[PDB]
Amino acid sequence: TYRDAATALEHLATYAEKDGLSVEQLMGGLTYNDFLVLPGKIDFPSSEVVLSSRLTKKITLNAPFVSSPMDTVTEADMAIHMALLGGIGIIHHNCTAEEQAEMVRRVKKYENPLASKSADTKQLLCGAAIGTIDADRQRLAMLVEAGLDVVVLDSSQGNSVFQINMIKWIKETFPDLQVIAGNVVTREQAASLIHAGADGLRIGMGSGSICITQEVMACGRPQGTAVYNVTQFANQFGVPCIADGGVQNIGHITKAIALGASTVMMGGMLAGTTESPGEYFFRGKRLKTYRGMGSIDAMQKLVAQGVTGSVIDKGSIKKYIPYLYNGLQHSCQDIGVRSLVEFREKVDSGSVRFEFRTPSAQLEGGVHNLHSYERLF
Amino acid sequence: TYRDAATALEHLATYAEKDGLSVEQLMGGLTYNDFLVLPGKIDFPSSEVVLSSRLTKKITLNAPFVSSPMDTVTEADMAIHMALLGGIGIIHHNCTAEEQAEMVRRVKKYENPLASKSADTKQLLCGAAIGTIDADRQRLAMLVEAGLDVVVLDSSQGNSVFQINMIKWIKETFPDLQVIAGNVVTREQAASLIHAGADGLRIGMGSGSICITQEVMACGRPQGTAVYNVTQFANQFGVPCIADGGVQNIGHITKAIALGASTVMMGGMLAGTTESPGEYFFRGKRLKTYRGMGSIDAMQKLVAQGVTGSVIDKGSIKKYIPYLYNGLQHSCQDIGVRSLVEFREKVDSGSVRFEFRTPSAQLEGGVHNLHSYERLF
Amino acid sequence: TYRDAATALEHLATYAEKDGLSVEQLMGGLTYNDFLVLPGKIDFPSSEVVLSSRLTKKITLNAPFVSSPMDTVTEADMAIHMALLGGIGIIHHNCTAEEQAEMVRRVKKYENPLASKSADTKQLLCGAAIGTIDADRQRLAMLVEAGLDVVVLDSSQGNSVFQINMIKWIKETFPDLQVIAGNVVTREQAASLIHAGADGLRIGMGSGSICITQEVMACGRPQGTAVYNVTQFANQFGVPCIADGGVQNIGHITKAIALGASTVMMGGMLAGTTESPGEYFFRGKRLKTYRGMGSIDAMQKLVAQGVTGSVIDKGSIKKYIPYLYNGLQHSCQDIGVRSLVEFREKVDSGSVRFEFRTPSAQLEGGVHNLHSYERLF
Amino acid sequence: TYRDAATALEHLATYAEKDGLSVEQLMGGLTYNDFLVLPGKIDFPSSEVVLSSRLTKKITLNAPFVSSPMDTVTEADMAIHMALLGGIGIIHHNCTAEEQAEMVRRVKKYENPLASKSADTKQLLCGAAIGTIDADRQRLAMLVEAGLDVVVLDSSQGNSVFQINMIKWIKETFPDLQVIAGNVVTREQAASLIHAGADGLRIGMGSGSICITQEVMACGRPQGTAVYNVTQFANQFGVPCIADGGVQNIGHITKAIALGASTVMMGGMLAGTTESPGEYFFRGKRLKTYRGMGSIDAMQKLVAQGVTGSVIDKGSIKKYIPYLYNGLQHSCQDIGVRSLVEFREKVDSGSVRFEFRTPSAQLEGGVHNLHSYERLF
Numbered sequence A, B, C, D: 001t002y003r004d005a006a007t008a009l010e011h012l013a014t015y016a017e018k019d020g021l022s023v024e025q026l027m028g029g030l031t032y033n034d035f036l037v038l039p040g041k042i043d044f045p046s047s048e049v050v051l052s053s054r055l056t057k058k059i060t061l062n063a064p065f066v067s068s069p070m071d072t073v074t075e076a077d078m079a080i081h082m083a084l085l086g087g088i089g090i091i092h093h094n095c096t097a098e099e100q101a102e103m104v105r106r107v108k109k110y111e112n113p114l115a116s117k118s119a120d121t122k123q124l125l126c127g128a129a130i131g132t133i134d135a136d137r138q139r140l141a142m143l144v145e146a147g148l149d150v151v152v153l154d155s156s157q158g159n160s161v162f163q164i165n166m167i168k169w170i171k172e173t174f175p176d177l178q179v180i181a182g183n184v185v186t187r188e189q190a191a192s193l194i195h196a197g198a199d200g201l202r203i204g205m206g207s208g209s210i211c212i213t214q215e216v217m218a219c220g221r222p223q224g225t226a227v228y229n230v231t232q233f234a235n236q237f238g239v240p241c242i243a244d245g246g247v248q249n250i251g252h253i254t255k256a257i258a259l260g261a262s263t264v265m266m267g268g269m270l271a272g273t274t275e276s277p278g279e280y281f282f283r284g285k286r287l288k289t290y291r292g293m294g295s296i297d298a299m300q301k302l303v304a305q306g307v308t309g310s311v312i313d314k315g316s317i318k319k320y321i322p323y324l325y326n327g328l329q330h331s332c333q334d335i336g337v338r339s340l341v342e343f344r345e346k347v348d349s350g351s352v353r354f355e356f357r358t359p360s361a362q363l364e365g366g367v368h369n370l371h372s373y374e375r376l377f
């Protein structure tokens, strides 16, 4: 004797809980590739998915995409086009204060729908990174004069007295300026910098494609676990967090947001693009140099926390960011959420479900058992 | 002092339960390679093993083998020979409705023991895939006129309003037509499509050899876990499920069925065969193109959920399907079951036992510690 | 304030149990490489270690080494020299009954301390494999006439009516003949064949270096778990068990015995030796063919459960078996046991301790972080 | 409604415990790469970090670095420069007693801040290894006459009657001489040698880069677990322990100390340096031979417990040890500890937190997803 098909939806009530795991059940020491999001119910087109995201307490973007402050990723060209496509760029500071201020000016003075713009002047939004030593106070002053919208305090370990004092000084001196503090990977770190007055947090330590901090400092955290534990705390204070490092595809972006991130920062993915700094070279493939700011070369302009490498040409971000945007829309559709806001609410309520992945399951999830294969878009 | 050998069978009663794990104990997020079935008692020849399998509520096959609806796997030639060998083929729809209807006609009009045939006309059984948009209503009408026996609603995420409405429309318009809905990987998805009136379910998301949905959508499920959790629900309603994706050998077929699948769908395994579409080419090995329907090439005839690749020549299925058939018989024999029906009953009663496999155990289970090696059959 | 060194031994009493895990605590689905034995106390030289081992109820060897019944491992030459070095050889049956009987005769008629010899005639001990069909009754009769000491019922799944009847027939017809039944990997299998009257058991399914039974039959068990669970049962009846398959080094032998095996069977390790059948060939390395009896080539003299491969030349066993013997002595010394009998007693009492090994720990345990490396003995 | 940022630090009290795991919670069978230390609070410069370390009960070094007693690592040249840089060298004994005594004399007679020197004569500290057989009594006498400061009883399994008697003999004969016993990996081993009168312990079995003891003896322990369980016992008696083997980078040193080690011993890392014995050779890379003392070559001057290999040129330790020193300072800074003494106290109190690392997390922690990459310092 079999059950009547008409009672199929009702019979779900006989189960203790929904299939798969809630986020809390899921979250030891795992990262993005160690799990999946289970599909939900589709009753809308992907084009309907809204990807509006909080960068800081006062700044909201139309897309959760942020380009990393690295000298092989983000200068004026990257910051301009990232802003035009609904994200934002963080200009690096491996350069003179004069040079950095000039790059900010190029972004703010640029003229030509989802574009990231200031509410008042309708100029493109621009971010910039700085250190937390005394000399950077002057550097920031020059950046602010150039029209800086948001500053990122750049550090591998942001929970320091130096950064705390810098944050306090900025809020007091430049109250209209949004401050993103970091990097952090623990609840205690986040509380410290939130208490200091941070407008946003940057999450990650060692997860970068070119980073080896975990190998030389023995210090860091798996990215997935870091994002979850930090945001679970920080979101209670309305402090948006950037998931920074270890993002290589659309799936990582979805998972980063699922675990509590408001935006995601990318370095390696955008490194090979036309708009990134540095020239192309052949090896017979078209490559661009991509290096950690803690590498000997970058610091040269000593203990290295990063390495110098190369990545394949990815083409222009004018096609690559839309690919990520459309992809994330389709990802949200499969999960059954119409916005990142809804996605956040559904996850915390336990409606969105997750599943672990054994090493075998991970291999199964990718390409396998082929003689050869070639195309993301 | 040692125990008397005569009391050996009786002494088993002193143990709390049988050696190894029941299926429920076994079932986180694992797939086929993560476990094994423990051997049982052999008191019959392998030739006695019956492999009769339910494809849908009303359709039963002599073998649990289904060829996937892909343009590099199943057209008329594949569907004909699959049917002749006791399975069935699902004709792809990456073509005009006219072209697809012609391929169905070729199968139904073909003339020449275990063969899959309609009960009334004794014509070869034929399956076909369609989308769930309005234009497909017309396409299905043409397929039905050509003598279609079963339709597969083709989607990576089948739990949508569009597919639900399509299922309702088909049952109402073509009541004699069997409908397989999918793809699904969760209990909630299955309930939705069963409630809609599905005659069978297609299980899998991201597990395909050419699929990368898990990588770009962050959405899917390990195949083993998906089959178990879906069928544990669906079998209560007498809805047979196809285990689709990640099958590479006879062992995967056995495990798929063990975990609750009624039939298994194969794409990559049948791709390199003579009866599959596409021509052979040399690279110095004989290869055939095998590509996901979500690949840029297939869609071309945009976010790719599949990749284009190649597989080695496997020869004719006239020898390959019998190899799978005989192999599965021997597999059932080792386990100690005389049919797939008995296999299903024994597993759910806890008589058939399972065992996890550590990564070391998996390497041990395959070929290892040789300088070189060569032959499945 | 620190503790007095004089109280160091006494302070161990404050701990709930000894460091590491007992065997029961250790024993899911793991195999040899997944764990280690913890060192004990050395108060004796390695030369004092006795490696006497039970092959069957009535046969004891001076070394726990058995050569596998494969046509690329054991014929007369191997069986003779294995016996001379304190082990035993099992002659394969991929040949006519006449040919097999001749090989046994060569062993028993051979004339020239730890040597394995019959108690009465002082002839070298000899084993031989047979099938369990009717034709093998005649074959066994010819082997017995040639002076066979022990017969191995050769099968990948030994728990069958055919093997059970064969065992009953042999005990009744040739009461003086020792019977080793198998292969088995579960408690239920062992009870069945012990109840039938087996004098020893052969443990393993899929763990062989050339075996792929787990891949095609989905049936088998990780070797470590199989040895433990079978012997934990079988040893209660005084039935010695051979750990067959997956042995590649001295460490595997120690672990096999630790988990309850009385002897270990080797195929791949002895395949490349001078005394094995088959000629050497160059590829620029000296190799010998090594193949599973379930391979197409071996069966040829169809579903393959084994593959044909090659192994590097290992030299003569006149140097290789002493290497294993001395190595196992040193292994026992490190653990702090003076015999395999003591080793068995110490393990079951919980005195010998074990430790799991993460994948990282396994890599650490081998050679790592070198530019290159070369020598077992 | 969001929480007030001012209450961020106070809100931490609502959590049951600190983020991450205490060391006890962390500690199955894992090693260094299986975990990380979570970052703390920085309120000091790295230059302030003190790395003073106990080698034995009476000997303290300014740096926790010890060069291993291997004939491809430490002779007079290495021992001199290790001492000059605040560590110590252990001269190997794969040589005549006369030759070893001469090497010690070269170190003690050498003349030319953090340098490791005797308190009385201000001569460079020098260590030396010996065996535990009768002939070594004479050898030690010659070493002591040459001015030996500390002796290491060299063995893969130090818990033996021979070593116990040697320790007793040395304390009685040369009371002023510091004795390091080992190697050990269990609590029971440590208690035995502490009770015998050891002044320090050497931890490790099989973890060496050139060691294969675990593979051939089946005996050993994952290094991380060994260090923790041994030191948790030994530190109660004020017996410093050397973490010996498996150290490849600064991160391993930090973790070794975190788990309870007082100093770390390095062989492979220092093998390729200018000051190590053996000449350079090209293969087109500059290499030096590095081999285990249990290798056939080393023993030659038989069952091998080590292998012969090669490592890349690392340059002079005059630059490499400062790199490790500065790196470890920065590591301590990130964790938020001002000394190794504080680091030890903070870990045992549960203030320093840890995190597991899945295989995915480990890959993420290193370099990944690059076309190519190059520089530690």
Ligand SMILES: *c1nc2c(ncn2[C@@H]2O[C@H](COP(=O)(O)O)[C@@H](O)[C@H]2O)c(=O)[nH]1
Pocket: A068, A069, A070, A156, A183, A204, A206, A207, A208, A209, A210, A211, A212, A213, A244, A245, A246, A247, A265, A266, A267, A268, A269, A291, A292, A293, A294, A295, A305, A306, A307
């Ligand atoms: C450690 N972390 C470093 C370094 N340079 C940059 N970064 C960090 O990694 C992120 C990039 O990660 P991807 O996976 O490439 O996207 C950056 O945003 C930054 O957080 C370094 O040298 N050492």
Ligand SMILES: *c1nc2c(ncn2[C@@H]2O[C@H](COP(=O)(O)O)[C@@H](O)[C@H]2O)c(=O)[nH]1
Pocket: B068, B069, B070, B156, B183, B204, B206, B207, B208, B209, B210, B211, B212, B213, B244, B245, B246, B247, B265, B266, B267, B268, B269, B291, B292, B293, B294, B295, B305, B306, B307
């Ligand atoms: C995701 N899944 C895809 C795609 N093309 C086909 N398929 C799915 O995979 C199965 C084939 O799996 P194999 O392991 O090759 O046998 C198909 O039956 C279908 O379910 C794709 O582009 N993206």
Ligand SMILES: *c1nc2c(ncn2[C@@H]2O[C@H](COP(=O)(O)O)[C@@H](O)[C@H]2O)c(=O)[nH]1
Pocket: C068, C069, C070, C156, C183, C204, C206, C207, C208, C209, C210, C211, C212, C213, C244, C245, C246, C247, C265, C266, C267, C268, C269, C291, C292, C293, C294, C295, C305, C306, C307
């Ligand atoms: C499955 N098992 C097979 C086959 N030929 C031999 N054997 C089994 O494996 C053992 C050898 O294992 P090694 O790891 O090489 O020492 C044999 O003793 C036997 O039990 C086969 O074709 N399929």
Ligand SMILES: *c1nc2c(ncn2[C@@H]2O[C@H](COP(=O)(O)O)[C@@H](O)[C@H]2O)c(=O)[nH]1
Pocket: D068, D069, D070, D156, D183, D204, D206, D207, D208, D209, D210, D211, D212, D213, D244, D245, D246, D247, D265, D266, D267, D268, D269, D291, D292, D293, D294, D295, D305, D306, D307
């Ligand atoms: C086992 N252990 C051996 C052998 N030679 C040296 N050693 C051990 O390994 C340590 C070196 O480890 P690395 O990872 O290279 O730094 C030595 O200090 C010693 O404890 C051997 O032949 N077999």
